[model samples]
Target: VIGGNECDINEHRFLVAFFNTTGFFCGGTLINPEWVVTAAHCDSTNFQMQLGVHSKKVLNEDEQTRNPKEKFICPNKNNNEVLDKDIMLIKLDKPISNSKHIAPLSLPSSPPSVGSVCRIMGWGSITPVKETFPDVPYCANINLLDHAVCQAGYPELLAEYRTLCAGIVQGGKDTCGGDSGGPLICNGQFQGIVSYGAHPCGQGPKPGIYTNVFDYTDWIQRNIAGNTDATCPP
Candidate 1:
């Protein structure tokens, strides 16, 4: 079962966007007041980012929102079927007012250790068959897996050097549709961006794949000014 627990209001505080026509479409994380990192695949032209969101159904006046001005997608992305370097950074029209509920998350200086536990947040469907998404943000815990093990399960789909894989070995738990581009936090550090997963949400051994954030730290720093609290190594 794809059982997701409702996240606390302040938890995953870096989550900035829950894109949808009227609700959630995909997820994004705030790197700074003006910059957000998400999957290049989740790019939408006409959209506004919803920050400090607790429930999708309930719109709070205090919740911060932003209109995007610039979008920078990784040059290595493949528009085709493969999810190689599927990452993007968005620049907001204005800086966000930092509060207890809304804050920027730190980018990792290095890759997470193998077998480390991580958490992902989204407002995507609990199940693959469901058409409508949830009204509240949902979270799931996952364990990091080695590339060899992940590639063995998803031989044709896995991409080395850029993709990070994680999920339950028994399957039946993972991020699915509309969860793309969301933050994958491990050890309180933003390490991954949701990229893709197997069909039917989480019904197989193929773990969910994410874009490793450590690989693009230089690119991110070049684009966005130093407004975030996190430090990126050389």
Candidate 2:
């Protein structure tokens, strides 16, 4: 898979790149040593990946830089036809030496705590032409907020029993649109994927919502090994 948010270490940064295009990227986590975990809606456009990277503006100095290998887009299986299942996987050009900076993220075998806190990062639009980063990276903190509060603000977002929500309602501290398919990490493990958020960010009482990663583990395993069996290798 790819890396994410060059803003700091442990951000799990990545780059959505292409052969000839400088693609867009939303941060995510490496669930398996080979599979990166993210949202389903991230497949809004064509994308490739770069993993084990640190800085967006510079190549990884850690000697564990993994180059982009391939690209995949989430299929439109829902009636909405939006890339809501925003998930992707990019086999690294080479394997990384497992270490503090380059390794897989822990995934919960069960439900995470109710009020868990996590982090997410991305290379989205900071403004009109500007973005979360020029080349390095940017990041934000996300607390595991109440699901009911999230449903209240994002009425359009179906807070399915399998899914959970996070973010603040008072505005300006949650994930926003264009940052779809990123990772929502909690308890030092990847728990959710950035699904959608309120418009005009930081609107109070309108916390951003995410897809519960725990609910989709089976689906994810199905996709591993090029869509073979489960029990992927690290």
Candidate 3:
């Protein structure tokens, strides 16, 4: 359920930003020189972006303060909140230049076709009670299910689109309760957002769903220009 942590990256590969309500980590693709895309529900405008971090405990209050330097650009600042549309992008006050370990990831210009295999990463809870605090960053490949299949498998997901459903419908190795707002990377490019999953993980015919970035090409381009045809120099 959770990925990246003492078990894999040794606290060096993932980038995370902490918010008062939750904590999130990079799905591996560095989207910008100082930005990471995640689920909007996982963060707020008042969160803190911390790079090269491994533990829940931040060293500096000011540097890694419990506040976000940036937040996702959504439709409303008021309260017209919508599920599946719960995507967020964070920008660090400063750019991290450590190419030896930390760097930016490429965003895909197009979404992968349904049934394509993709990799996912995050630090989320695998067990109930959501105890994987600051979830560990780990990676696994899951097959993308078509929108119809996904919706049919879980009628509740009919309203969820502009996103893709992935992982084991029977709860094999996939994102779960604790992995919200992470990245679903494919072909060295980011393809989706770890949005939500049917509780209990790997439920019968229920796979983890993500906010498909490919569906939001216009929004992405308007906010972050040249993201599709460019890469930042680390």
Comparing 1 and 3 on lDDT, the stronger one? 1
lDDT of 3 by residue, 1-234 (tens): 633223444323444544444445333234767667777666543445555544455342222322345555565432444454667666666666744445556678776877677776555665533455443345566778767656777665656345587875445666765567667766656788777776666564777778877766566555665343332111
lDDT tens digits, residue span 1-234, model 2: 112233566545332222126454565666555556565444434455556665556666553434445544343335263324444555555555565456676567877787777776655545422233345445666678777787777656653334567764444566553566666677776777776665566566767667777766665656654673333111
Runs in model 2 deviating more than 4 A are 1-7, 10-20, 44-46, 62-76, 79-96, 126-134, 225-234
C-alpha TM-scores of all predictions: 0.89, 0.73, 0.74
- Which pairs clash inside model 1? none
Against the true structure, candidate 3 reaches a TM-score of 0.74
- For model 3, the stretches where C-alpha displacement exceeds 4 angstroms are 2-29, 54-67, 76-81, 128-135, 225-234
Candidate 1 colliding pairs, count: 0
Tell me, by TM-score, which candidate is best: 1
Worst 10 residues of 3 by lDDT: 225-234
Residue-by-residue lDDT tens digits, candidate 1, 1-234: 155787777786788764657656778999887888998887767888888887756765678888888877655545675476688788889898887678888789787888899888887778766654777778888888887766777766645547788887777678878888899888778989888787777755688888889878887887676443333332
For model 1, the superposed segments whose C-alpha errors exceed 4 Å read 20-22, 225-234
